[PDB]
Design a protein around this ligand. Sequence first.
Ligand SMILES: CCCCCCCCCCCCCC(=O)OC[C@H](COP(=O)(O)OCC[N+](C)(C)C)OC(=O)CCCCCCCCCCCCC
Ligand SMILES: CCCCCCCCCCCCCC(=O)OC[C@H](COP(=O)(O)OCC[N+](C)(C)C)OC(=O)CCCCCCCCCCCCC
Ligand SMILES: CCCCCCCCCCCCCC(=O)OC[C@H](COP(=O)(O)OCC[N+](C)(C)C)OC(=O)CCCCCCCCCCCCC
Ligand SMILES: CCCCCCCCCCCCCC(=O)OC[C@H](COP(=O)(O)OCC[N+](C)(C)C)OC(=O)CCCCCCCCCCCCC
Lengths: 239, 239, 239, 239
Amino acid sequence: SHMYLRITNIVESSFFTKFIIYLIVLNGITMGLETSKTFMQSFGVYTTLFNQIVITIFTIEIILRIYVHRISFFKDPWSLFDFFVVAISLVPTSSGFEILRVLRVLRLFRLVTAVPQMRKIVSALISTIPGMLSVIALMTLFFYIFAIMATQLFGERFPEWFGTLGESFYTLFQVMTLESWSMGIVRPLMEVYPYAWVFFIPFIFVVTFVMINLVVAIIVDAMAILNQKEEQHIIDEVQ
Amino acid sequence: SHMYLRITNIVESSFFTKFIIYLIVLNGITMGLETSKTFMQSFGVYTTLFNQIVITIFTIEIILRIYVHRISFFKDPWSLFDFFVVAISLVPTSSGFEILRVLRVLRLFRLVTAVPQMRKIVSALISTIPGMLSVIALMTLFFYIFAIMATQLFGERFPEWFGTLGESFYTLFQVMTLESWSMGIVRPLMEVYPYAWVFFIPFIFVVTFVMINLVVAIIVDAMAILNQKEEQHIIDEVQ
Amino acid sequence: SHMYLRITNIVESSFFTKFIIYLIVLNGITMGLETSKTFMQSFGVYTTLFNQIVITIFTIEIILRIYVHRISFFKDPWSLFDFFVVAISLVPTSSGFEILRVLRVLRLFRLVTAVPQMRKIVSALISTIPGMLSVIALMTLFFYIFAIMATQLFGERFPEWFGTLGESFYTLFQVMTLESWSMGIVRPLMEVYPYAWVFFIPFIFVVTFVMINLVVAIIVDAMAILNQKEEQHIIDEVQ
Amino acid sequence: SHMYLRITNIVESSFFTKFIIYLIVLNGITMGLETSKTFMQSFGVYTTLFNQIVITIFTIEIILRIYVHRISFFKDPWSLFDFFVVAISLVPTSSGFEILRVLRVLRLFRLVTAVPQMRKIVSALISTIPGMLSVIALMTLFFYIFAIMATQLFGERFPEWFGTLGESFYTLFQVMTLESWSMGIVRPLMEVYPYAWVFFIPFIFVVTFVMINLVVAIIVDAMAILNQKEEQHIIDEVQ
Ligand SMILES: CCCCCCCCCCCCCC(=O)OC[C@H](COP(=O)(O)OCC[N+](C)(C)C)OC(=O)CCCCCCCCCCCCC
Ligand SMILES: CCCCCCCCCCCCCC(=O)OC[C@H](COP(=O)(O)OCC[N+](C)(C)C)OC(=O)CCCCCCCCCCCCC
Ligand SMILES: CCCCCCCCCCCCCC(=O)OC[C@H](COP(=O)(O)OCC[N+](C)(C)C)OC(=O)CCCCCCCCCCCCC
Ligand SMILES: CCCCCCCCCCCCCC(=O)OC[C@H](COP(=O)(O)OCC[N+](C)(C)C)OC(=O)CCCCCCCCCCCCC
């Protein structure tokens, strides 16, 4: 085309991404100083302006990127993310939900989607999640079953920790982290239900024994592959 | 046969397992809402009925499965488990042991034995336990020896933590998890027995150094096997 | 010889080790019941007798084993251990050091030296220690340097935690375990010395980063060996 | 040359390093006794003298080493370190910064730079840091983004923990270590902001899931290399 390809050469240019990566870091320092109320009393409106500027520059950048990339933009996770963290940044501060004014900061994660060094890492870390979804399901069911049981056993005399399935979910996650599991939870529990240890010591055993085997499988299974991709390139040459 | 093979085609069918997996998830949501007393005041008897229904459907399912599978049912762990978690579900609520009304929830673990994706994981995780039984024994003896020693050294001035072999077992397990081992246990201990650190710092060292080597062996030993199953398939082809 | 070889066939026999392994387990149950004062009020002297019996049986067993094994007994760690844990068991209860009456229990560790299944594990776990001694030295020096620094920085306003090199050693080990390192130690420290985080956050970083690399090296280095013992058996056959 | 090569043979000699390694250990014991005020009341000035001696001996040693090694001394990290930890040791005790009198102890780290066994380890541990710098950056950005968010969400009602970006940095690091993350931080937070768990449970998930994959990558990636350096030496011989 003509106007399309004129835009495309700008969007796909190094200066464009450099300019965005530039603005991202500039806004990043802006949001960190925005925490200090000394700075907000002094250089206050300077940054609300400079924030409102970058938001529209990012909307323009997203609009241009949509015209260039067409359906592929809405099938790219890094683009879909960039879309949503600016869409969040666009909903005005006026609402009965001031938490969206805090979700503004997620637009600093653009420095991941914009810098290909970070994307490579983030992709590598996420790439382990697919196989773990099956083990994640077993653990989530395990948690749900014990959270039912704990709510029924302990939620009566211990409402804060167990009086509700959601609380027992939180508390059991705290037991998984071993955070004050004994002194803070099980030992007070045992002052009323002496056999509560029969519930939690196995829970700590299963939960831990799975987390370990999850990591062990991640290592040993990833490397039977390299031990067969080598087992193949060696039989390649003797034939 | 005739009536046997008529049953077998039903039990071994996809609809049968699908229908059980269906009921399992339905009962799973039932038990989670059963925790809320708002729901139990409203839709209360709806779920006691629907529970009593699924229990008999499961007994029928187990009865049918026993007639089909014969001795192999009572030699299959997944079947033996399904047997016991429904047998637990059958003992009536009337007893001086209301904990069996809570063990009802273990029938949600049927979703493991019924969904072959989960069974594959559970089998993989359990498959590491066999070799660990030898190291588990050494640790359990190590614990027993120190639990004797700790009960004799500290159980006098510190009954809650050490006044009994069982308590010293629990406390030493808490020291293994490092849960408040210093601020909560050893530091108060040292206010009376200044050399208590001579007992626990080595205990933390041995217990940790074994747990690490247990995991390291799980990895390195699992993969000398893949490094010899490859060492074999390479000598295969040069001869 | 004549009387020598008559003894040797007994000592080296299966019944002899079986009889010792038997007595060890019997004494093991004895010491566990010896903790209960209900049992000691009832079956009390029964076990002091039965203990005094096993001690001499073990001395006889050690004496016989010394005559058979000659200098090799005092060059065998399992024998040297069996020697010392019975020698400890022989020093009479009368002393201004009643802790030796508790070290009696270490004679339950004979079940390790007597059962070859356990010895194999204990040997495997200890076999990692040799290479770690070099990294252990660096960490022990690292601890000593910071324990000097912490005693000088914090031992004034905080004697319990840091008022002495030994206490700073203990406290720093507690920081290594992350046991209440922030809420219990560094946060109170920062109420007086606001930059104490500059001391401990790096200490947590170095200490952790070494522990991880210690384990990583244990795995990756153990398995370049299996990756070259295979690299050798493959070049073996193509020549 | 003449005077140059006369110095060089001394500096590069075994006695020279031995004499320094000697003095280092001697000063190491000196600084440990210097903590005891009983010792400082008695043998006090003995060690201030002996310290002032070793400092100049080390300056001489550094001066000689600079004349020998020329530009290579100021391009060697072990030398650059030895330079700085003695330069720190030279700034006189008189200042409004008595912390430099504590940084004297870093001259005990010379025993690392002087003993080639330690240098080999320290080099091996540091050698993992290069590849981790990319993942370290992602985590440091992740921390910065959430530390902004936490300061804005919680710093109002919770100034000690979150009232400042620096405090939220410290607190989030404490949550990463799981040190009292629930009982000490999130549970008090939830007494005011009930959905604070929506902030921290994911933070614990991401932070942990990265730390694990960081270690897993360190292992699995280090050993595709040994699995291709072997994959190469095997194709070497079949051609
Ligand atoms: C998108 C990527 C962008 C990357 C940008 C990286 C650099 C960001 C720098 C931001 C600096 C913000 C400093 C700031 O707000 O300081 C707040 C507080 C001081 O609060 P304040 O109320 O001013 O103190 C008043 C003191 N008084 C009473 C004596 C008048 O003081 C503090 O909180 C202490 C200073 C904390 C600095 C934390 C720096 C974190 C760097 C993270 C780098 C990540 C790179 C990926
Ligand atoms: C066999 C497999 C079956 C899988 C089924 C998965 C889905 C199960 C859903 C169960 C939902 C149960 C909800 C429930 O009971 O909520 C209890 C509490 C509310 O208690 P409630 O007393 O009603 O609150 C009264 C409030 N008031 C005063 C204003 C009137 O509120 C809470 O506790 C908050 C909601 C917690 C939801 C936790 C969801 C966990 C999902 C785990 C999924 C595992 C998949 C394998
Ligand atoms: C050399 C290898 C030998 C291996 C031997 C393994 C078996 C050892 C069994 C020892 C059993 C000792 C039982 C015992 O002393 O119990 C103490 C306490 C009860 O104290 P007590 O003062 O009698 O309670 C009075 C109750 N009252 C007021 C109602 C009258 O009750 C408790 O503490 C509860 C029971 C704790 C049992 C712990 C069992 C640990 C097994 C470890 C196995 C390791 C195998 C390698
Ligand atoms: C460059 C490498 C050099 C390596 C040198 C290794 C050896 C260093 C030995 C230093 C010994 C220092 C002993 C010391 O200052 O003890 C301080 C305190 C006692 O304080 P003090 O105020 O004398 O107690 C008075 C008692 N009263 C009231 C009854 C009169 O008592 C304690 O703190 C207890 C003793 C703690 C000893 C800690 C030993 C750590 C060894 C680390 C080895 C690392 C090797 C790389």
